[PDB]
Design an enzyme around this catalytic site. Structure first.
Site, PDB file in Angstrom:
ATOM      1  N   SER A  22      51.698-100.311 -62.271  1.00  0.00           N
ATOM      2  CA  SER A  22      51.180 -98.929 -62.467  1.00  0.00           C
ATOM      3  C   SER A  22      49.702 -98.749 -61.912  1.00  0.00           C
ATOM      4  CB  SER A  22      50.919 -98.568 -63.956  1.00  0.00           C
ATOM      5  OG  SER A  22      49.681 -97.773 -64.262  1.00  0.00           O
TER       6      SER A  22
ATOM      7  N   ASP B  75      42.553 -95.338 -71.995  1.00  0.00           N
ATOM      8  CA  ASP B  75      42.263 -94.016 -71.536  1.00  0.00           C
ATOM      9  C   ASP B  75      42.563 -93.032 -72.863  1.00  0.00           C
ATOM     10  OD1 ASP B  75      41.461 -94.379 -68.830  1.00  0.00           O
ATOM     11  OD2 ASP B  75      43.701 -94.567 -68.232  1.00  0.00           O
TER      12      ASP B  75
HETATM   13  N1  LIG Z   1      43.734 -85.679 -62.100  1.00  0.00           N
HETATM   14  C1  LIG Z   1      44.050 -85.403 -63.196  1.00  0.00           C
HETATM   15  N2  LIG Z   1      43.966 -84.084 -64.045  1.00  0.00           N
HETATM   16  C2  LIG Z   1      44.141 -83.995 -65.076  1.00  0.00           C
HETATM   17  N3  LIG Z   1      44.535 -84.865 -65.910  1.00  0.00           N
HETATM   18  C3  LIG Z   1      44.632 -86.191 -65.561  1.00  0.00           C
HETATM   19  C4  LIG Z   1      44.389 -86.385 -64.202  1.00  0.00           C
HETATM   20  N4  LIG Z   1      44.535 -87.699 -63.908  1.00  0.00           N
HETATM   21  C5  LIG Z   1      44.947 -88.246 -65.250  1.00  0.00           C
HETATM   22  N5  LIG Z   1      44.960 -87.393 -66.035  1.00  0.00           N
HETATM   23  C6  LIG Z   1      45.401 -87.681 -67.623  1.00  0.00           C
HETATM   24  O1  LIG Z   1      45.826 -89.190 -67.967  1.00  0.00           O
HETATM   25  C7  LIG Z   1      46.992 -89.382 -68.418  1.00  0.00           C
HETATM   26  C8  LIG Z   1      47.490 -90.772 -67.759  1.00  0.00           C
HETATM   27  O2  LIG Z   1      47.413 -90.552 -66.226  1.00  0.00           O
HETATM   28  P1  LIG Z   1      47.784 -91.298 -65.307  1.00  0.00           P
HETATM   29  O3  LIG Z   1      47.741 -90.797 -63.898  1.00  0.00           O
HETATM   30  O4  LIG Z   1      49.211 -91.466 -65.603  1.00  0.00           O
HETATM   31  O5  LIG Z   1      47.082 -92.787 -65.380  1.00  0.00           O
HETATM   32  P2  LIG Z   1      47.967 -94.440 -65.708  1.00  0.00           P
HETATM   33  O6  LIG Z   1      48.495 -94.310 -67.113  1.00  0.00           O
HETATM   34  O7  LIG Z   1      46.788 -95.260 -65.425  1.00  0.00           O
HETATM   35  N6  LIG Z   1      48.982 -94.664 -64.409  1.00  0.00           N
HETATM   36  P3  LIG Z   1      50.496 -94.536 -64.025  1.00  0.00           P
HETATM   37  O8  LIG Z   1      50.959 -93.348 -65.000  1.00  0.00           O
HETATM   38  O9  LIG Z   1      51.329 -95.648 -64.152  1.00  0.00           O
HETATM   39  O10 LIG Z   1      50.313 -93.732 -62.455  1.00  0.00           O
HETATM   40  C9  LIG Z   1      47.845 -88.460 -67.893  1.00  0.00           C
HETATM   41  O11 LIG Z   1      48.896 -88.227 -68.672  1.00  0.00           O
HETATM   42  C10 LIG Z   1      47.116 -86.999 -67.992  1.00  0.00           C
HETATM   43  O12 LIG Z   1      47.034 -86.322 -68.962  1.00  0.00           O
HETATM   44  N1  LIG Z   2      47.193 -99.144 -63.065  1.00  0.00           N
HETATM   45  C1  LIG Z   2      46.558 -98.181 -63.503  1.00  0.00           C
HETATM   46  N2  LIG Z   2      47.118 -96.979 -63.860  1.00  0.00           N
HETATM   47  N3  LIG Z   2      45.317 -98.791 -64.195  1.00  0.00           N
HETATM   48  C2  LIG Z   2      44.686 -97.898 -64.683  1.00  0.00           C
HETATM   49  C3  LIG Z   2      43.575 -98.889 -65.098  1.00  0.00           C
HETATM   50  C4  LIG Z   2      42.438 -98.712 -65.954  1.00  0.00           C
HETATM   51  C5  LIG Z   2      41.325 -99.701 -66.418  1.00  0.00           C
HETATM   52  N4  LIG Z   2      42.453-100.828 -66.814  1.00  0.00           N
HETATM   53  C6  LIG Z   2      40.531 -99.348 -67.079  1.00  0.00           C
HETATM   54  O1  LIG Z   2      40.346-100.025 -68.268  1.00  0.00           O
HETATM   55  O2  LIG Z   2      39.820 -98.491 -66.990  1.00  0.00           O
HETATM   56  N1  LIG Z   3      46.456 -95.340 -68.427  1.00  0.00           N
HETATM   57  C1  LIG Z   3      47.186 -96.458 -69.022  1.00  0.00           C
HETATM   58  C2  LIG Z   3      46.476 -97.633 -69.284  1.00  0.00           C
HETATM   59  C3  LIG Z   3      44.976 -97.582 -70.161  1.00  0.00           C
HETATM   60  O1  LIG Z   3      44.723 -96.325 -70.504  1.00  0.00           O
HETATM   61  O2  LIG Z   3      44.129 -98.491 -70.191  1.00  0.00           O
HETATM   62  C4  LIG Z   3      47.886 -95.947 -70.283  1.00  0.00           C
HETATM   63  O3  LIG Z   3      48.143 -94.704 -70.511  1.00  0.00           O
HETATM   64  O4  LIG Z   3      48.192 -96.804 -71.308  1.00  0.00           O
END
Ligand SMILES: Nc1ncnc2c1ncn2[C@@H]1O[C@H](COP(=O)(O)OP(=O)(O)NP(=O)(O)O)[C@@H](O)[C@H]1O
Ligand SMILES: NC(=[NH2+])NCCC[C@H](N)C(=O)O
Ligand SMILES: N[C@@H](CC(=O)O)C(=O)O
Ligand SMILES: Nc1ncnc2c1ncn2[C@@H]1O[C@H](COP(=O)(O)OP(=O)(O)NP(=O)(O)O)[C@@H](O)[C@H]1O
Ligand SMILES: Nc1ncnc2c1ncn2[C@@H]1O[C@H](COP(=O)(O)OP(=O)(O)NP(=O)(O)O)[C@@H](O)[C@H]1O
Ligand SMILES: Nc1ncnc2c1ncn2[C@@H]1O[C@H](COP(=O)(O)OP(=O)(O)NP(=O)(O)O)[C@@H](O)[C@H]1O
Ligand SMILES: NC(=[NH2+])NCCC[C@H](N)C(=O)O
Ligand SMILES: NC(=[NH2+])NCCC[C@H](N)C(=O)O
Ligand SMILES: NC(=[NH2+])NCCC[C@H](N)C(=O)O
Ligand SMILES: N[C@@H](CC(=O)O)C(=O)O
Ligand SMILES: N[C@@H](CC(=O)O)C(=O)O
Ligand SMILES: N[C@@H](CC(=O)O)C(=O)O
Ligand SMILES: [Mg+2]
Ligand SMILES: [Mg+2]
Ligand SMILES: [Mg+2]
Ligand SMILES: [Mg+2]
Lengths: 386, 386, 380, 386
Positions: free
Chosen positions: D168, D121
């Site tokens: 996650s 990401d």
């Molecule tokens: N709906 C949204 N609006 C604005 N920013 C977002 C949004 N969703 C995700 N992000 C951004 O993406 C980063 C990672 O988001 P996140 O929802 O924590 O995903 P994750 O890393 O895949 N899973 P987890 O933290 O384990 O629930 C966040 O810190 C935000 O900055």
């Molecule tokens: N458990 C999570 N928050 N997963 C996010 C998965 C993202 C997925 N691995 C990708 O590369 O797009």
């Molecule tokens: N959302 C997770 C995994 C990914 O970005 O692939 C992270 O912040 O590491």
């Protein structure tokens, strides 16, 4: 800590040689490889013990270079972005290979090179090193030192006591490369007299010269009927092609690290080898095999350019290219004349060409059936458009 | 019954015009297209009426040819099996397109052509014929008649009173091709004085000549500052290039019909355009876009060669190539000297080249991280191999 | 004159056997192969002798089939037009290979088959035949006779005392296929009960079943810990997958001879193997190798579908695929349940699954972004 | 200094909001996007203000997400490494697009996100930011702060009045994904009850359900005859398919940053759409077009996965896919049953299917010529091999 340094014998690696002693106060094992740069590599070796190396090694790697790197690449018909025959790209993996090998023999923790932080060579050297010895410590002085300019570097050199002294150059058995300086302006023609390996077209003989190259299972093995080892053959063809101004290319290429760069390349031997190979392939390779191979060549080329030589994707493609190349056996006859390479003849013991199939297993009316079936989907399409 | 014959104006197409009348007893509408063969079509047209045609049509199609066929193909960087620029290939679809148009206008159920059953042209004419009008009937005398020899054919001409007279050739605005006869021996260099469109290099000017080509949105629009129409532009470049003997190639190709054939081609203007286009692409196209486009170019080429011009696959790929070519705006400067074409400079309003990125966009540590990330999988690989 | 006929034992090839004797006034040597059609080949060999064959041959080719055709094809991840696992496609080359070999041994100048002139099998049979023996003569009765319909064919058979018993079918160790008849309307769902090799998902067991498949160097060598030969292994997975209704596909495919055709295929064992293979590859294959491989698979698939098996292109790609597949060593664990196959676990001796620091990532990003920023700045 | 923070509302971004203010001595503008994660975006918006944001924006981007990101991607038949429908991948570009938009409107020099330094990401967020606004400054706290563990992070949150709470997760309108924790052991099946968007097959209805999806020009426009907007349509198919437990995948994928990771994905609506699209394409797409298209789909998939959405390669390929997709008009009929999606029917106004050609445009005899021509080169090879 001991450090193995890819030592070229010039200003920069000399500065680097002391920089490493100074900064890391480490035991420095120098390594110079003869890959046809046109430098008395043994001098390099002397100058290295003279700059403070605790040991200096020089090796004649010409044969290994052409045999284990240039040939496998040519077998794949590798051409980067339409013109670059990868002269510099393919040599780097060989150097890093030995660096790591030596480091393992000297019980050395790290290796160093003087490729700058702006180019492709740093990637080639390091991807190779990490791929061969994942625990190897790499030191790239150009990315770690404070020097800003050559004045500062000349200075620093004059200091410690290292002899000091329009475009950058890299030369080896495969080619001589030019870039930077006055070459940095894409609209500026290269300067007269720059080329070193090739005679100037305009100064090329007034009489064309014919040459024949024999291929055996994908690799060149003789020129004009004389069997020649890999290195001796590239050498020979460089001489023959060089006198005629063959193999000059001028391009603005895309570097792996992200920016465009204007480069000029002269590859006399390799250019003759490229056209000769396709000449022999034109009789020994199947149509559908050739068409598939050609669409993969470009990918293999970027792999080489980027530095992925000792990488699985490249070794996998090598399996395909080597399989196909094994059928390339025959002789190409080319005409050299003022910068150009013209294929004028080719023959193969196992040629797939049959004049009886072209002159006026084949029956004309079969063509109609062929055509009708091929046309069916097209006819259906039109009808649907009504 | 009416038959629209693609009449070139020579012996064969004349013998065929008679043949069609005796065999089908139908009205034969002759159609001759001017595409740069260097024949006065209007003469072929009157000869058609003399030979028996009930109606003869002659049309100047050089502009349509270059604009709607050669250019779109050039935007794709189409090159068949390493060297063939497809001069004959892109012309056939144009001709067929008109045969069918005329037939539809004259209320003719069939069209006819004189391509042989051993070649690619029959497929080109017919796939485009069926693709454009599925219910059209095609007559190919070469696949239907009894003539067993040249002599038998010359006699048939006399019986019907038709004027009568080392290799075969096809010439149009894009090139002149030679194959067959003495050329059937791939080890035999072509005969001296064979070439017609390009002066012989050994006899070309002693001083290089410089030419500049401007490309607007993927297509060449001017030469040395002079804006020229597509056909006029290709003509100009043929003159300039020919004078220098540029664009000569000699290959053993794979026909779509199954067998290999030795072909010789001279494409002066097209070869200058090929390199000029890439020179401009070198500043205007993104690295990845370029790499993808080049791996698709060969496929598009085979499509054109086989005859799939008015086919959905080609039109689909064309959408990709046109999208990419749209950014190709700028100027290429090339040096012409005895058979060779050298790019010496290029410029573009929206060039992506920046000297500041190479002069001695990120800092040193950036490269290190890029390298570490890129090597990660190679290191895991090596560690696992433990 | 002798003609080696690919004899399957049904009405068409029986009629063909009679037709060939009279039309070519030749001696006909019948060849029937056991490739898992679920028919007694010996019965076919005997019927052929009764129908007039001068000699009848029957061979159990199930092991050769899976080992030399199905396995190499699977190593390539071959899938035609997104779904077709090519059950019938890879089988034809095998039959023709034997036809030509038998013709060589019996001194026969020709070979024959009963594939029609509007399908892919005729191409597969002949391309392989011509490829293995260039001067062999081929006879395809469907392209040479003039029967004007079934009625006329039944009549012909009755005349020669050939016993005459809603869609067409083909079945072998890899799959069972259905097309034609009631299936020709792509908007119509197949009729209930049509399936043979697989249980209807609605009738599958109420409990899911776990299965483990081991791959050695690109080939499956065991099931649930039991080492099994190629043919025996495919059979075992067909039983396990079939009981659960796994491997059913309904597609409209493009034939090599020009038109579209609606086909239905059940490949229980091969479907389990497809996902099991990718599961092991996910730990043993390198990222870039995998991506390149998957982009070549479709080309390979169309080669098989078209009939270019004993062709240099396919042989060349096989070199690539085999090289890559040699790393596929491990075990896939799958969960089967009412029509579906779920990967649920995987492991391998040389798994590449599990160094840098967050900081390295910034550099990677900056460098990757460079050309994009330049493009943006230029767009101004 | 102003910083636009991609604020999701959880603990991490709340900590980051406070961290940014004090670290950069700046004011933070919070942006929360509603992309179907199933949360109240207004609550996050309000929580941001309570956490200290100078301004908090919350937008419903569901329709834009599906119309401008999901549909274009599906139109390409994008699938990563065999199974990943890219649920998280295509949502990131959309988030970053707005961050950069808001930064320009607010006069903010930088943007921030809470993606870690070891994921994909970060690359997706940053590559789109830099591509859209080259001078934007990007702050990724995970790659900059000194927090040494979760314990310290909770204490920091608690110290700043921030409320504090097996794998996650990431959920949006396209899917719900799971990775990390217990899922990190590739041999272990996911824990019971983990899935959220889809019912377990064991609990799915015993009665299969038929669903029809109408495609207009590459995009799904109706479900069971009811016209639905992009987001409403994806929603409907998630509901229908979800009840039947459709769209579950369990894979070990290759991340762009170099390592493999075990991921579990549930994509009910997207999975139905995937097969529905191919069903409609089976009648509307030409054979050769389809084959070319499927060989490019994987490439497009990695581009999306790596984060190259607003990149020239992707947009060029998008030109090809959109051209092809324009012909995809018709209805697909599928049968949903305990985890599976079965295509049972398809129809199209301009279907290229004619049982006219299968039941018992040519005659078997044409077939013979077709075979002979196709076999010619294979026969030549055999004769040559002797
Ligand atoms: N709906 C949204 N609006 C604005 N920013 C977002 C949004 N969703 C995700 N992000 C951004 O993406 C980063 C990672 O988001 P996140 O929802 O924590 O995903 P994750 O890393 O895949 N899973 P987890 O933290 O384990 O629930 C966040 O810190 C935000 O900055
Ligand atoms: N458990 C999570 N928050 N997963 C996010 C998965 C993202 C997925 N691995 C990708 O590369 O797009
Ligand atoms: N959302 C997770 C995994 C990914 O970005 O692939 C992270 O912040 O590491
Ligand atoms: N023959 C060699 N033996 C050992 N190391 C070498 C050799 N040639 C090059 N290298 C390594 O590559 C780095 C760059 O070498 P170099 O010859 O300076 O190439 P360049 O950067 O392309 N051109 P220039 O501007 O002339 O220095 C050096 O610092 C060395 O570490
Ligand atoms: N200028 C033209 N106008 C109309 N039809 C043409 C024209 N040129 C070629 N054709 C068609 O193409 C067929 C083959 O033409 P032809 O000029 O004989 O080419 P060739 O086979 O390449 N070589 P050769 O006949 O040996 O000079 C003719 O029979 C015509 O139907
Ligand atoms: N097991 C076999 N051994 C030898 N030849 C076979 C065998 N199976 C099929 N063939 C050949 O393939 C041709 C077509 O066989 P066939 O079993 O009719 O398949 P089909 O056309 O797909 N379906 P159906 O509608 O049942 O005829 C036959 O005429 C045979 O020549
Ligand atoms: N002047 C030089 N030293 N040039 C070296 C050129 C290297 C070439 N640009 C490459 O990427 O391999
Ligand atoms: N001698 C000739 N008339 N040659 C025409 C060459 C045509 C070329 N081989 C092609 O396939 O387009
Ligand atoms: N019902 C049948 N006999 N079907 C045979 C299916 C063959 C399949 N269409 C193929 O091309 O290989
Ligand atoms: N050798 C040069 C160029 C390159 O590596 O590409 C450098 O060190 O930067
Ligand atoms: N025009 C020539 C060659 C070809 O068509 O390929 C012929 O009619 O045979
Ligand atoms: N086996 C069938 C179908 C096919 O060959 O594709 C036939 O003979 O027509
Ligand atoms: Mg240097
Ligand atoms: Mg001719
Ligand atoms: Mg049959
Ligand atoms: Mg997170």
């Amino acid at each position: 800590m001991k450090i193995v340094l890819a030592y070229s014998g010039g200003l920069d690696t000399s500065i680097i040689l002391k920089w490493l002693k100074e900064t890391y106060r480490a035991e420095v094992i120098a390594f110079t490889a003869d890959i046809g740069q046109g430098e008395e590599v043994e001098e390099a070796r002397e100058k290295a013990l003279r700059t403070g190396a605790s040991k200096a090694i020089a090796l004649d790697l010409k044969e290994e270079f052409v045999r284990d790197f240039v040939f496998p690449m040519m077998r794949a018909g590798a051409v980067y972005e339409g013109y670059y025959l990868l002269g510099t790209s393919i040599a780097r993996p060989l150097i890093a290979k030995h660096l790591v090998r030596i480091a393992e023999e000297e019980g050395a923790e790290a290796i160093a090179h003087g490729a700058t932080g702006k180019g492709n060579d740093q990637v080639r050297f390091e991807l190779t090193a990490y791929a061969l010895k994942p625990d190897i410590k790499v030191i790239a002085p150009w990315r770690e030192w404070s020097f800003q300019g050559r004045k500062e570097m000349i200075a620093y050199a004059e200091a410690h006591g290292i002899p000091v002294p329009p475009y950058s150059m890299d030369a080896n058995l495969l080619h001589i490369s030019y870039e930077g300086g006055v070459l940095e302006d894409p609209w500026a023609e290269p300067p007269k007299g720059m080329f070193r390996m090739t005679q100037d077209p305009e100064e090329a003989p007034d009489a064309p010269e014919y040459v024949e190259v024999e291929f055996f299972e994908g690799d060149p093995v003789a020129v004009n009927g004389e069997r020649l080892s890999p290195a001796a053959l590239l050498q020979r063809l460089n001489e023959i092609g060089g006198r005629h101004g063959v193999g000059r290319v001028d391009i603005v290429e895309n570097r792996f690290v992200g920016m465009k760069s204007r480069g000029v390349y002269e590859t006399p031997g390799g250019t003759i080898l490229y056209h000769a190979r396709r000449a022999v392939e034109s009789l020994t390779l199947d149509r559908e095999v050739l068409h598939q191979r050609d669409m993969l060549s470009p990918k293999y080329a970027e792999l080489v350019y980027y530095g992925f030589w000792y990488a699985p994707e490249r070794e996998a493609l090598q399996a395909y290219f080597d399989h196909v190349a094994r059928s390339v056996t025959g002789v190409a006859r080319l005409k050299l004349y003022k910068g150009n390479v013209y294929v004028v003849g080719r023959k193969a013991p196992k040629s797939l060409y049959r004049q009886d199939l072209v002159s006026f297993g084949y029956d004309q009316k079969d063509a109609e059936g062929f055509i009708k079936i091929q046309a069916l989907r097209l006819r259906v399409r039109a009808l649907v458009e009504r």
